[PDB]
Design an enzyme around this catalytic site. Structure first.
Site, short mmCIF file in Angstrom:
data_model
loop_
_atom_site.label_atom_id
_atom_site.label_comp_id
_atom_site.label_asym_id
_atom_site.label_seq_id
_atom_site.Cartn_x
_atom_site.Cartn_y
_atom_site.Cartn_z
CG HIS A 85 -48.21 44.29 -37.76
ND1 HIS A 85 -49.07 44.46 -36.70
CD2 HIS A 85 -47.65 45.50 -37.99
CE1 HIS A 85 -49.03 45.73 -36.31
NE2 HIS A 85 -48.18 46.37 -37.07
CD1 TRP A 298 -48.05 59.19 -39.61
CD2 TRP A 298 -49.31 57.64 -40.62
NE1 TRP A 298 -48.18 58.13 -38.74
CE2 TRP A 298 -48.95 57.16 -39.34
CE3 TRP A 298 -50.11 56.84 -41.44
CZ2 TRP A 298 -49.35 55.92 -38.87
CZ3 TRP A 298 -50.51 55.60 -40.97
CH2 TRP A 298 -50.13 55.15 -39.70
C1 HEM Z 1 -41.67 52.50 -34.95
C2 HEM Z 1 -42.25 51.67 -35.83
C3 HEM Z 1 -43.78 51.59 -36.03
C4 HEM Z 1 -44.78 51.88 -35.19
C5 HEM Z 1 -44.69 52.33 -33.71
C6 HEM Z 1 -46.04 51.65 -35.88
C7 HEM Z 1 -47.30 51.82 -35.36
C8 HEM Z 1 -48.47 51.86 -36.08
C9 HEM Z 1 -49.80 52.03 -35.54
C10 HEM Z 1 -50.16 52.19 -34.05
C11 HEM Z 1 -50.67 52.01 -36.56
C12 HEM Z 1 -52.19 52.17 -36.42
C13 HEM Z 1 -52.96 50.86 -36.41
C14 HEM Z 1 -54.42 51.22 -36.40
O1 HEM Z 1 -54.88 51.87 -35.42
O2 HEM Z 1 -55.13 50.87 -37.37
C15 HEM Z 1 -49.92 51.84 -37.79
C16 HEM Z 1 -50.44 51.77 -39.07
C17 HEM Z 1 -49.75 51.42 -40.21
N1 HEM Z 1 -48.43 50.98 -40.24
FE1 HEM Z 1 -47.06 51.29 -38.75
N2 HEM Z 1 -45.75 51.25 -37.17
C18 HEM Z 1 -44.37 51.20 -37.30
C19 HEM Z 1 -43.67 50.85 -38.43
C20 HEM Z 1 -44.23 50.53 -39.65
C21 HEM Z 1 -43.53 49.93 -40.77
C22 HEM Z 1 -42.03 49.56 -40.74
C23 HEM Z 1 -44.42 49.76 -41.77
C24 HEM Z 1 -44.22 49.19 -43.19
C25 HEM Z 1 -43.04 49.07 -43.80
C26 HEM Z 1 -45.70 50.27 -41.30
C27 HEM Z 1 -46.87 50.29 -42.02
C28 HEM Z 1 -48.09 50.74 -41.56
C29 HEM Z 1 -49.25 51.04 -42.38
C30 HEM Z 1 -49.33 50.92 -43.91
C31 HEM Z 1 -50.24 51.45 -41.57
C32 HEM Z 1 -51.66 51.87 -42.02
C33 HEM Z 1 -52.63 50.73 -41.75
C34 HEM Z 1 -54.00 51.05 -42.28
O3 HEM Z 1 -54.14 52.00 -43.09
O4 HEM Z 1 -54.97 50.35 -41.87
N3 HEM Z 1 -45.54 50.73 -40.01
N4 HEM Z 1 -48.58 51.75 -37.46
#
Ligand code: HEM
Ligand code: HEM
Ligand code: NA
Ligand code: NA
Lengths: 717, 717
Positions: A85, A298
């Protein structure tokens, strides 16, 4: 409405809402910096124990804190989201956003809906910031933590560069016109996203996780994913690798209704110590956490790198369902995989789930071909994800000379716009003086030399530190064909003549001294300004620092350089098509991209006008009878009340300045006249237009010119 | 509503409209300054040829220009109004406004309704500004032109001091809450004007020339004249002398309907070159001029000093009439004096006319006694007008040491808060070291010495440069009795002890050396800080500049100093009643008055907390286990997430900080917690709270402390 005290935001813009705002030229002022004038972050970084720093971050990731307990006992996945982010605000149209300034810790980014819970993520890293102090910026620490998280959970990264200097007030960026969070007034036609934006709604990083405008259509979501990621410099393969690599880890958070979550950090009460989104649902943290409102895990191994994301994506069939907070998500049909997904705090297992945007990786025919390949070749996923993550975290780092620390891989990369290393001795005083004489004897005019040097150097933008005169790319595609560089004009002639001087000098130079074409372009403009100053009665020397090298076309991504083309350059009185604001607003925006102050912008405009740097040699703003000599005539004539200004009788948006008789004496543009109209700019013009001012003007102009010539020269800083 | 580009004013204040705004601590930043680092305006104007300047202003005044023809062939009266308006924004409550910064050339003042046509007046003086350049500021030139106008037309002024330093962006001042020009939302009770305002409507200098809210009742207008001029530091005699002296010259302008007048300068189009109020009535200038909408010529000699004003005021009976623009005004009854008043451009004579506020000088019984005195003995009017005018245009000049040039009169004046000249040798470094040792042995605690030195020095405010530690007025009325200074009767002991030390030193002083009580108050604080630094393991020297002198009570206007009493001082955690905003907003306003940056404000708060400088030694914000020791414990403990903060059970605006065991460990105010809550301030706390930060914090605190101690020390700068 009501006017407010300045300490609560009141000011002149309240009375004149559309007024020009020169404050964009004094962002991050030195008086607001606690570091002091002598602080040298590059010197501080050069002493970090990266091994010890890595181990301290590892310890932070595995020591759960009671005010925000760690999912699966590992903060790593949260830090990967934090870093993605941080780098994920970047956009190619203006180079703004990105992780280079640590702006996630300031408003408005710290309070974006998509950045919920990252206030806790950054807070967890204070024990590391505390221990290393000024040797380690928040900007570097935020992305390095994500990189460390990847490596601690089994993924080997390509490398890492330090060197992002902390800033002390937020960079003010246009993120959209919507006055409501998650608003959408940025689309027209079928699905044309408004320039310069790179997200689908106000306050999102890229796309909506429930699909476009909340509609979980994975095919339609892939349209937004492809376009927003493209505007962040990522292609189809890079995009799939990033999303697959990221969602290999961790989980979303939507354990209860979202209306139990309190205000975002900037609107939160004092006692919350800068944290926001305080929830009254259960404990408000941990197993009861509410972040996005989606409740998805996931993979079955959320704290380990493996291939289970694509194996789960293609291994089950998917049907639409709702989270405990009421958000759309997908889960496996027919009860398949029940209990196989672990709970973050020891509860029972759950079923497989996916976002609608995850399913885009399988439903979209381009993403499907890419991601299905990785089912049986996860080594290619690991290679693409490492390259894409490295590019994501370093996109706004600028020339590779800036990458600091012991973890920088030295392989050259096309997206870094590489320039060759120096392979010969550099020109000195005697050679520089000898090259200046060849230039004056070549027949190239002051206008041609100044215009060419400005065109090459003013392609730099400080937002992402791309562009500039190093590389000599003014003679390559696409810069040699840019309309403002005027290919129809003398440009090809100037290039040819400078190449003849280079070959001629290099064949007879002393030792192995050689001059690059890139250096000769800048040197020519410097030599022309020295001549123009003498022609006005000023014996001055223009500084010149050699060392630029010549890139080849094969090292110049033509499509990537498209975004650097000036659509407006008030310093050349050029206004292309598609600008969002009138010409005087784009002048200030251009000065901001050049890292110029209001005085520096003012002397450069007045100087370039009388030097003949104007696009197509237009007479607009050329308030002098001594063109191609460096005088302050622009400022003197602008303040002359013997001139009466009127909109042109043609309806072309220019102005006519008439004298007492009624004869048209001058013509000018909005960019020209704003310096005599705006009260803060006119204050500056009155300094450089005074009888005592011409020595100071020449000094200030040469200093600002030298600054622009050197904008990308991190190789000699 | 829609968000806008930053270059069009968009920013974080749009999303959080009441957020704390740290911009007030980086106004007029150095990067926006065209003059550069070593520019010293005082050095520049000190060598100006005042005789040539006066003759050049004289030529400007008598050389009519076609774009704004001169009434009666003389711009003098217009320049008097310009100068009066420039100084006429000053107000005693916070010292803001006044002519000291040349702010009339910037927004919003340059576009106030009352400052109409003064855009032309300032423009006429560019030939003078152009000739003298950086030796002459616009701030000086604007009031000097008015002073020259008086002399040119036969009035001998008291003198004049140069030294007003030009600024490069407007000072942002709260002028009122009304969001409509000429609005009035500033009165409560019968007629209590809102503090800190000193005008009756938004965009007016003092009062409405048509009477209160446009109702031409002269007795009611006198109520408003008396109160607003009182808030501008003028008593009854000074007020009448100013009005009579001013309206001895010139005329008002209202030849046609006011809806033919175009937008104010900041809303005017580019071609008008910073001028506004373009009129389509006739020629729109000269004999057709429309400024206020009133058409009054007070005297039969508009370009000459004489006693015509009160002679006409008492020589006719008056009746209410209307200007050609529909404004109320008064004209002589029964057609008396028809044709006795000259036309500014040779037209037929006119009848005697007066404003409703001019008739206040005859209708109000206090003013009537004053003005009838001048009808009988006009020699007394010249004396009072000279004294009031000199005070008007120098009120915000600060200590007399700032007055530069050959026209400065030597006479002492009570309103200048004078301090005695140094009549002895100053203490050297040996005597300073001895005095520091004696103070530390005197039995006065570090808390007592730091509290007293801060109480004396923090009385300074940069708005009008009043207050400060010079004069030693902490022992005089009223400062010795201010609640924040002497809460429990401890200050008397401190003063007596330092006086005993002073008497002892001076009795045994070598040669012509003598030390002042004023210096010892400051030196005591500096010795206490050296001691507390040693207690924390830092040997450091606090700088000290001798030279303060001791004022007497007879030289200290007790009621004038009343406006300097702090109603809030977040640096001592003091909050009285009557503040317009929550405490953290008042903290930033105070830091702005002390000319402090955000880093300087931050180190001072953290330092003064652990030094025991709090009002009544309250434990609020004293986050340390070692009082009387200069550590960074305030910042380390503020960032400790082992502490959970909640509002105190008693809704008294305080907070409880509980550690792991749920036990209350710290307490704090809003001023304390804002440094851990505000995202920009917490970034500063994280610098000074790091492991590596103790030496830097001690250096930065001492430098910030020394700056506050030297705020009024213009005698050495
Ligand atoms: C279409 C692209 C993406 C969408 C729509 C998206 C959306 C989201 C959302 C909604 C969450 C949940 C946040 C929460 O409720 O805690 C999440 C978690 C996460 N995202 Fe994505 N994301 C995208 C791409 C990516 C990319 C490019 C990365 C890293 C290279 C990434 C890494 C992560 C990780 C590691 C989490 C887990 C966070 C945690 O465990 O607290 N995401 N994402
Ligand atoms: C209650 C106090 C005052 C009121 C209501 C007032 C109001 C006005 C107004 C409405 C005008 C006409 C502006 C125009 O239409 O051009 C004017 C002109 C003028 N004022 Fe005052 N004023 C006050 C005090 C003063 C003072 C204290 C001075 C100077 C010491 C002063 C000096 C002048 C002069 C010289 C003019 C003539 C300007 C010219 O000839 O263009 N006034 N005043
Ligand atoms: Na950027
Ligand atoms: Na002031």
């Amino acid at each position: 409405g009501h006017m407010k005290y300045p300490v609560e935001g009141g000011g002149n813009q309240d009375w004149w809402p559309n007024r020009l705002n020169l404050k964009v030229l004094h962002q991050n002022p030195a008086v607001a910096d606690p570091m002091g004038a002598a602080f040298d972050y590059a010197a501080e970084v050069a002493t970090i124990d990266v091994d010890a720093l890595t181990r301290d971050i590892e310890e932070v990731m595995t020591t759960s804190q009671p005010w925000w307990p760690a999912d699966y006992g590992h903060y790593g996945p949260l830090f990967i989201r934090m870093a993605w982010h941080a780098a994920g605000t970047y956009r190619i149209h203006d180079g703004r956003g990105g992780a280079g300034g640590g702006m996630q810790r300031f408003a408005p980014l710290n309070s974006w809906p998509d950045n919920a819970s990252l206030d806790k993520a950054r807070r967890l890293l204070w024990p590391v910031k505390k221990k290393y102090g000024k040797k380690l910026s928040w900007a570097d620490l935020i992305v390095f933590a994500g990189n460390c998280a990847l490596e601690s959970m089994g993924f080997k990264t390509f490398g890492f560069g330090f060197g992002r200097v902390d800033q002390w007030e937020p960079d003010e960026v246009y993120w959209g016109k919507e006055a409501t969070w998650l608003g959408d007034e940025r689309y027209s036609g079928k699905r044309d996203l408004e320039n310069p934006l790179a997200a689908v709604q106000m306050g999102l990083i890229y796309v909506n996780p429930e699909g476009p405008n909340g509609n979980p259509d994975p095919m339609a979501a892939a349209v937004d994913i492809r376009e927003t990621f493209r505007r962040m410099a990522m292609n189809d393969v890079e995009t799939a690798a990033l999303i697959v690599g990221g969602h290999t880890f961790g989980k979303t958070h939507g354990a209860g209704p979202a209306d139990l979550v309190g205000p975002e950090p900037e609107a939160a009460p004092l006692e919350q110590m800068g944290l926001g989104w305080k929830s009254s649902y259960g404990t408000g943290t941990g197993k009861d956490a509410i972040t996005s409102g989606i409740e998805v895990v996931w993979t079955n191994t959320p704290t380990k790198w493996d291939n289970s994301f694509v194996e789960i994506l293609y291994g089950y069939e998917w049907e639409l369902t709702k989270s405990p907070a009421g958000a759309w998500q997908y889960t496996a049909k027919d009860g398949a995989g029940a209990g196989t997904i672990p709970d973050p705090f020891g509860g029972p297992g759950r079923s497989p789930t996916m976002l609608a945007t995850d399913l885009s990786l399988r439903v979209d025919p381009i993403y499907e071909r890419i991601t299905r390949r990785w089912l049986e070749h996860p080594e290619e996923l690991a290679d693409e994800f490492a390259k894409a993550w490295y590019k994501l975290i370093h996109r706004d780092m600028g020339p590779v000379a800036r990458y600091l620390g012991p973890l920088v891989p030295k392989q050259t990369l096309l997206w870094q716009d590489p320039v060759p290393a120096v392979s010969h001795d550099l020109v000195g005083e005697a050679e520089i003086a000898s090259l200046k004489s060849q230039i004056r004897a070549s027949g190239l005019t002051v206008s041609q030399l100044v215009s060419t040097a400005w065109a090459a150097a003013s392609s730099f933008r400080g937002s992402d530190k791309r562009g500039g005169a190093n590389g000599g790319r003014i003679r390559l595609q696409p810069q040699v064909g840019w309309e403002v560089n005027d290919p129809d004009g003398d440009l090809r002639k100037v290039i040819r003549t400078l190449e003849e001087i280079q070959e001629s000098f290099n064949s007879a130079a002393p030792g192995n001294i050689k001059v690059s074409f890139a250096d000769l372009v800048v040197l020519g403009g410097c030599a022309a300004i020295e001549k123009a100053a003498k022609a006005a009665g000023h014996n001055i020397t223009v500084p010149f620092t050699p060392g630029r090298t010549d890139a080849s076309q094969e090292q110049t991504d033509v499509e990537s350089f498209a975004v650097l083309e000036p659509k407006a350059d008030g310093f050349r009185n050029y206004l292309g098509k598609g600008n969002p604001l009138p010409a005087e607003y784009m002048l200030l925006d251009k000065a901001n991209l050049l890292t110029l102050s209001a005085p520096e912008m003012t002397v450069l405009v007045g100087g370039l006008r009388v030097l003949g740097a104007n696009y197509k040699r237009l007479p607009l703003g050329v308030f002098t009878e001594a063109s191609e000599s460096l005088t302050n005539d622009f400022f003197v004539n602008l303040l002359d009340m013997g001139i009466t200004w009127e909109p042109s009788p043609a309806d072309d948006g220019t102005y006519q300045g008439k004298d007492g008789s009624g004869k048209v004496k001058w013509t000018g543009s909005r960019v020209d006249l704003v310096f005599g109209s705006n009260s803060e700019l006119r204050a500056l013009v009155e300094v450089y237009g005074a009888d005592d001012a011409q020595p100071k003007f020449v000094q200030d102009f040469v200093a600002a010119w030298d600054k622009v010539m050197n904008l990308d020269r991190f190789d000699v800083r």
